[PDB]
Design a protein around this ligand. Structure first.
Ligand SMILES: Nc1nc2c(ncn2[C@@H]2O[C@H](COP(=O)(O)OP(=O)(O)NP(=O)(O)O)[C@@H](O)[C@H]2O)c(=O)[nH]1
Ligand SMILES: [Ca+2]
Ligand SMILES: [Mg+2]
Ligand SMILES: [Mg+2]
Length: 166
């Protein structure tokens, strides 16, 4: 079956793992559990087609630079996550965009900008700010909550559709 190599990137703590675990394992549990590198392979049906989602869940940790270069090189589409209550994480996300472009020598890589934790009240990043940034890379902006599952399938399936019709 067709395989989609998805990579979830972003600053530490923004909810990369929570989003992936919500998608694959249908749940959220609030816990501290930083990631090194975790792979999830799940066979799903998206718009009538059987496909294999090969999702690499990456570390926010800035020390794994070499590891970041290799998974950007081999990844097909990128979920670029920040948290809407963490301005720094949003400032950092454009750095991820530029690294993806440099390593893949393309400004045509399928990507989705994900503003996560949209269930929390203390929002510090306005949606308009994130839409602007997304527009300037030609990519969609989708807000998510790994806790309530809001937007989660939207974000991941939109990325698959961005690949599908590249
Ligand atoms: N309210 C709320 N909390 C969330 C959400 N997503 C994640 N969290 C919480 O925020 C923390 C960070 O989540 P986590 O998924 O581990 O982030 P990460 O980006 O994978 N971290 P790392 O880069 O270290 O692997 C955890 O306490 C988690 O429960 C969300 O959508 N809403
Ligand atoms: Ca559930
Ligand atoms: Mg993680
Ligand atoms: Mg290059």
């Amino acid at each position: 079956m067709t395989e989609y190599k998805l990579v979830v990137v972003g600053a530490g703590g923004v909810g990369k793992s929570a989003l992936t675990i919500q998608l694959i394992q249908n749940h959220f549990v609030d816990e501290y559990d930083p990631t090194i590198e975790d792979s999830y392979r799940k066979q799903v049906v998206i718009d009538g087609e059987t496909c294999l989602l090969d999702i690499l869940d990456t570390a926010g940790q800035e020390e794994y630079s070499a590891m970041r270069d290799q998974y950007m090189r081999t990844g097909e589409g990128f979920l670029c996550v920040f948290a809407i209550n963490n301005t720094k994480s949003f400032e950092d996300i454009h750095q991820y965009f530029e690294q993806i472009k440099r390593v893949k020598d393309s400004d045509d890589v399928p990507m989705v900008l994900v503003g996560n934790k949209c269930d929390l009240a203390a929002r510090t990043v306005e949606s308009r700010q994130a839409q602007d940034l997304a527009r300037s890379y030609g990519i969609p902006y989708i807000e998510t909550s790994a806790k309530t599952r809001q937007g989660v399938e939207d974000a991941f399936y939109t990325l698959v559709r961005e690949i599908r019709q590249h």
